[PDB]
Amino acid sequence: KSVIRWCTISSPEEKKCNNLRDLTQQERISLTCVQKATYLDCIKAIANNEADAITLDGGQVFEAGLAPYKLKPIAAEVYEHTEGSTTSYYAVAVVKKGTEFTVNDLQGKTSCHTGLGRSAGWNIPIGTLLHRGAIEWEGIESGSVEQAVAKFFSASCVPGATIEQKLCRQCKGDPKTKCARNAPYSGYSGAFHCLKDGKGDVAFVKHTTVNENAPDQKDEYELLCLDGSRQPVDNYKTCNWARVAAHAVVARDDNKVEDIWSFLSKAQSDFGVDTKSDFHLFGPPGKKDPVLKDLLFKDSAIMLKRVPSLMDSQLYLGFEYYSAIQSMR
Ligand SMILES: [Fe+3]
């Protein structure tokens, strides 16, 4: 009857979306999938009524909420929390055991990031190191944050970086695709593999990333904490760089939001973590090639929760994280 258009940003993603399309062809709200080059092309397409929805990291919810787009988060991913579940996660910095540098010794190291402008992979680590005085950046007029970061680290893999060569030097893949936002070393799992393969000394990822990727070998890794110590991977509640809002589905502020939520509400009922189907909407998490990870929704999401309609992107991210992204922008 009514169709919603999901906007995807990679070929494994479009494939996953088209599999869900085939499984919901008999539902009152059906699905079709369009694929774009980047999440930004998807924000443009949705604001242009060529697509209806996409899940975005908190840093990208920020951009989606800006004029001329003015898309709003309509549903948030929920992650497992010791006390039930939460719509937030922790940004951590993962290093290997037996290297011995602290957060104060990061100058000249190589680094692995989920993507330019993402919460855990960029906004939180780069924003924190500017605040601590480690990365010297004197405002946007002084040039880009990319330039300041490429001065700090000796080389990096930062998917989506465009000004600095050095920020794509450590990425794996074809020349044309190695530093793309859907490259091999992109996302939480991609940045973890960049560290595992020795292409970075530190990977800026989230609290579930080592479990999702090397659960057997997680004691070969540890976390770099803000107080200068190193703690085990499971000690992220006391060794994290920030708690950030969950990834969220964004949409135009118009009446299609109810069709999108009814579609999502039913799809996680049928294909959620307790599904009897072979199709999983969320993950499952576990070792597999990183380009197959966090497709449509993160592998670590366990449910979607409706966001109150009165929350826009600023209220969703919170005033403090919103002004932190505005000050690096
Ligand atoms: Fe994220």
Contacts of 205 (CB under 8 A, 6+ apart): 91, 92, 93, 94, 114, 120, 121, 188, 191, 192
What is the rounded distance in angstroms from the CA atom of residue 129 to the CA atom of residue 212? 27
Q: Which two tokens stand for residue 217?
A: 């070998």
Q: How far is the CA of 123 from the centre of ligand 1 (A)?
A: 10
Whole-angstrom distance, CA of residue 236 vs CA of residue 117: 22
Ligand 1 centre to CA of 114 (Å) is: 8
Residue 297 Cα to ligand 1 middle (Å): 11
Would you say 120 is a known binding-site residue?
Answer: yes
* Interstrand relation of 242-245 and 221-224 (parallel, antiparallel or unpaired): unpaired
Burial degree of 154 (CB within 10 A; 0-12, 13-18, 19+): middle
Measure the N-to-C terminal CA separation of the chain; round to a whole number of Å: 42
- Please provide the CATH number assigned to the domain covering 2-78+248-313: 3.40.190.10
The annotation status of 216 as a binding-site residue, yes or no, is no
Structure tokens at 222: 């540890």
- Cis ω on the peptide bond leading into residue 284 (within 30° of 0)? yes
Residue 161 is encoded by which pair of tokens? 């970086």
* Beta partners for residue 53, in sequence order: 6
- Residue 113, SS3? strand
Q: Tell the burial category of 165 from Cβ atoms under 10 Å away from its Cβ (0-12, 13-18, 19+).
A: exposed
Bridge partners (DSSP) of residue 56 are: 248
* From-to residues of CATH 3.40.190.10 in the chain: 2-78+248-313, 79-247+314-324
3-state secondary structure of 151: helix
Topology (CATH) of 79-247+314-324? D-Maltodextrin-Binding Protein; domain 2 (3.40.190)
In the reported structure, the alpha carbon of residue 265 is separated from the centroid of ligand 1 by a whole-number distance in angstroms of 22
Q: What angle do CA 99, 166, 152 make, to 5 degrees?
A: 55
| Residue 1 in tokens | 């009857």
Resolution (A): 1.6
Q: How far is the CA of 290 from the centre of ligand 1 (A)?
A: 15
How far apart are the C-alpha atoms of 113 and 170, rounded to whole Å? 10
Give which of 110, 117, 121 is closest to 168, Cα–Cα: 110
Q: List, in order, residues 6 or more apart from 98 with CB less than 8 Å away.
A: none
Angle 124-131/319-328 helices, nearest 10 degrees? 80
Amino acid symbol at 265: S
**Cα 308 to middle of ligand 1, angstroms:** 21
* 289 labelled ligand-binding: no
Strand partners, 36: none
Q: Report the separation in Å between the CA atom of 234 and the middle of ligand 1, taken as the mean of its atom positions.
A: 19
- 206 forms bridges with which residues in the sheet? 91
Amino acid in position 93:
A
Q: Does the annotation place 67 within a ligand binding site?
A: no
Measure 321 CA to ligand 1 centroid, in angstroms.
13
Q: State how far the Cα of 285 lies from the Cα of 61, in Å rounded to an integer.
A: 23
Single-letter amino acid code for the residue at 108: G
